[PDB]
């Protein structure tokens, strides 16, 4: 299968990513070293994940070294919910770009539909515990989105965590200059999203699948979840290919034309996660896989249910 897809942009983007939250900033140098080492070229970021500059340290060795040029890496990013606002949007976005060593980014996305009163705390909260949005609309953040284009500070613009009708209030907007390239979503065997996947590839937006291990590290997991890795029925189509549960649900992505960012800090499984191009899982096994659908999301943001722009009331 081809490494890379195409992308409205006119860009090429690889379709195996390394995640980095949750990645401890005393390890994720080293991951991201050998994560390029054994072949990665596309890295997903954050400012509200807190390891930028130690996620650069590893980009700016790797050029260094001259084991990759910086033509062939993919560096993604997010504009966080507290910098919204269009005064905003260039700072937060040459944050990142100081921090990752970079001067420009391949892909920019709208973390989160959800604005939040800028300041100090990315999740600033009133005296009852309630989030506290601000009044910049989605509309305008991608204005400012599009700026970042037209001054050379990013190759790409997306979303992220964007509902269908979301996605189609950026496709409607009136003067719209960019489409969104990409829109990242979580997806795997539980939650498969099929109407919004069709409905974004309908329109030439590509979708990056996050979480799609199930997020074993998430901070809020409880015993009662499902898990992924432990399935015994998706344990039974990677032993018949002879190949890991992770292995199984990274390429499960890749051939419903998805990008996928699965995220390790360990050396033997960044390398196990990108041993995905040698194997096909076949039609009945993809149906299979989408047969395990129930809705469930490691990122549901409960805390931001009355934000008006929540993503996750709309069915899809
Ligand atoms: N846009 C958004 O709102 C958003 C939200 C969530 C995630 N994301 C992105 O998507 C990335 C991936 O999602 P995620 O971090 O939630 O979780 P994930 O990639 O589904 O799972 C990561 C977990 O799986 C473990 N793991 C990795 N490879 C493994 C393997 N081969 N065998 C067994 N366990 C393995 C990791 O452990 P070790 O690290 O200890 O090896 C870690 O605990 C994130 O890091 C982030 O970049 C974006
Ligand atoms: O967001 C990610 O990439 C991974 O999760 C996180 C990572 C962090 F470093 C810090 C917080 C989160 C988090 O709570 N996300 C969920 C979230 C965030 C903002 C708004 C909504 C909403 O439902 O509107 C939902």
């Known amino acids: 299968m081809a490494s890379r897809i195409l992308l409205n942009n ?3 983007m690889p379709i195996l990513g390394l995640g980095t939250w949750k990645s401890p900033p005393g390890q994720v140098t080293e991951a991201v070293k050998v994560a390029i080492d054994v072949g990665y070229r596309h890295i997903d970021c954050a400012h509200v994940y807190q390891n930028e500059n130690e996620v650069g340290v590893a980009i700016q060795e790797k050029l260094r070294e001259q084991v990759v040029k910086r033509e062939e890496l993919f560096i993604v990013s997010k504009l966080w919910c507290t910098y919204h606002e269009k005064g905003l949007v260039k700072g937060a976005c040459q944050k990142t770009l100081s921090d990752l060593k970079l001067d420009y980014l391949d892909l920019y996305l709208i973390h989160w539909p959800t604005g939040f009163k800028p300041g100090k705390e990315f999740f600033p909260l009133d005296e009852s ?16 989105m599009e700026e970042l284009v037209d001054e050379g500070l990013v190759k790409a613009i997306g979303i992220s965590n964007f509902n269908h009708l979301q996605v189609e209030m950026i496709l409607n907007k009136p003067g719209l200059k960019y489409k969104p390239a990409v829109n990242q979503i979580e997806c795997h065997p539980y939650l498969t999203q099929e109407k919004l996947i069709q409905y974004c590839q309908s ?14 590290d998430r901070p809020w997991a409880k015993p009662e979840d499902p898990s992924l890795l432990e399935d015994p029925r998706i344990k039974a189509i990677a032993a018949k290919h002879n190949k890991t549960t992770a292995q199984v649900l990274i390429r499960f992505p890749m051939q419903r034309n998805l990008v996928v960012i699965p995220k390790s800090v360990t050396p033997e499984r960044i390398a196990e996660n990108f041993k995905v191009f040698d194997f096909e899982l076949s039609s009945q096994d993809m149906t299979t896989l989408l047969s395990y659908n ?16 929540y993503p996750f009331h709309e069915e899809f």
Do not use: F
Request: aromatic share 6%.
């Open 129 to 144: 515990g309630n989030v506290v949005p601000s009044d910049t609309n989605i509309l305008d953040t991608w204005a400012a």
């Open 203 to 216: 329109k030439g937006i590509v979708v990056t699948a996050y979480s799609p291990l199930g997020s074993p």
């Open 294 to 309: 129930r809705n469930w999301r490691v990122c549901g943001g409960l805390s931001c249910t009355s934000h008006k722009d």
């Open 10 to 12: 006119g860009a090429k």
